[PDB]
Amino acid sequence: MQILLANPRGFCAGVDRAISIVENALAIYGAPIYVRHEVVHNRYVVDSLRERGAIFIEQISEVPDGAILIFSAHGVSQAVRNEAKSRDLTVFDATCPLVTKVHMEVARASRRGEESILIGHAGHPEVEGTMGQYSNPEGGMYLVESPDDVWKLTVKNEEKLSFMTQTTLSVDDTSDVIDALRKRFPKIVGPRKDDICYATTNRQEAVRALAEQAEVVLVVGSKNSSNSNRLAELAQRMGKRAFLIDDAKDIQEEWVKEVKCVGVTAGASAPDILVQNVVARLQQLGGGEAIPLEGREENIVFEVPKELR
Ligand SMILES: C/C(=C\COP(=O)(O)OP(=O)(O)O)CS
Numbered sequence: 001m002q003i004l005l006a007n008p009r010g011f012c013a014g015v016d017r018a019i020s021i022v023e024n025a026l027a028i029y030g031a032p033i034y035v036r037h038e039v040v041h042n043r044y045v046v047d048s049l050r051e052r053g054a055i056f057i058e059q060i061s062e063v064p065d066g067a068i069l070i071f072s073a074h075g076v077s078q079a080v081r082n083e084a085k086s087r088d089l090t091v092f093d094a095t096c097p098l099v100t101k102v103h104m105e106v107a108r109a110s111r112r113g114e115e116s117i118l119i120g121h122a123g124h125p126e127v128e129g130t131m132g133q134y135s136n137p138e139g140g141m142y143l144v145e146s147p148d149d150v151w152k153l154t155v156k157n158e159e160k161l162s163f164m165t166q167t168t169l170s171v172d173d174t175s176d177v178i179d180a181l182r183k184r185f186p187k188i189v190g191p192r193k194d195d196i197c198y199a200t201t202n203r204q205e206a207v208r209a210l211a212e213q214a215e216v217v218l219v220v221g222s223k224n225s226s227n228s229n230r231l232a233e234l235a236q237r238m239g240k241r242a243f244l245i246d247d248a249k250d251i252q253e254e255w256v257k258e259v260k261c262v263g264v265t266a267g268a269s270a271p272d273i274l275v276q277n278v279v280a281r282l283q284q285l286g287g288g289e290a291i292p293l294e295g296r297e298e299n300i301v302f303e304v305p306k307e308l309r
């Protein structure tokens with residue numbers, strides 16, 4: 001059985017920075033370091049950091065006075081930030097710079113009382129954080145997930161309207177939502193394309209290339225990782241069987257029995273060690289040397305803040 005690896009796969013720049021922020025804080029200040037929300041959506045990373053003394057909380061009211069609190073890479077609402085700010089907490093912010101860029105646009109529209117529409121999935125923390133930058137009652141901030149949601153939305157002033165997106169969406173589905181927004185609201189303003197980041201775009205392109213060759217695709221990533229679920233969905237829509245797995249224990253032998261080509265990729269929050277263990281289990285089940293596919297080169301790095309070197 002041949003094993004192909006997607007390229008790029010695995011950690012993006014925002015995840016590598018966020019994990020280093022929690023590790024460096026643990027190193028500088030000792031346990032406990034409080035973290036608002038799982039720092040990235042990956043059980044192995046999160047379990048690791050917990051066992052080293054990070055404590056993951058959903059609400060600032062769970063954190064003690066005098067503590068160090070880190071916001072997760074997915075970002076937080078102004079309400080959460082202000083609630084931390086008014087408490088006796090030392091705060092470090094691991095929000096990815098590419099999420100912060102969208103937050104600033106939302107805040108600018110709020111200041112103007114001009115309405116804004118976010119394309120994203122209800123309840124996800126990045127959506128809570130982004131919708132949470134808008135606060136002007138004169139204006140409005142609306143969430144749409146699909147074309148049908150666009151078809152039902154009505155706004156106060158469709159002449160002064162902009163749109164933003166979640167950074168980890170399906171490139172193809174978001175394209176359809178934007179086409180709907182422009183047909184319903186011809187004066188709507190947005191970025192040239194969307195706010196989907198380089199890493200989500202790149203991993204989706206790499207999985208499309210992988211699934212062209214492979215009969216079965218394994219995506220390493222946790223169940224609550226949105227971007228990892230998009231990679232599995234992409235391969236499934238191409239007619240391949242595709243499974244989202246946390247680690248090599250999750251592989252069922254029936255999934256690869258008599259499969260001639262199996263592909264492996266990893267979401268933006270999954271460490272490479274998990275991919276190595278998956279490759280080792282596929283070898284136990286018959287596969288040969290893993291072959292990396294040629295892929296778009298990534299070169300962006302985001303540094304930790306100097307207070308945490
Ligand atoms: C921090 C982010 C993504 C890195 O991957 P993740 O699995 O932690 O998060 P989602 O794909 O947003 O669920 C959201 S920008």
Ligand code: SF4
Binds near residue numbers: 013073099167198200
């Ligand atoms: S998925 Fe994109 S926006 Fe999110 S942390 Fe990674 S680089 Fe940043």
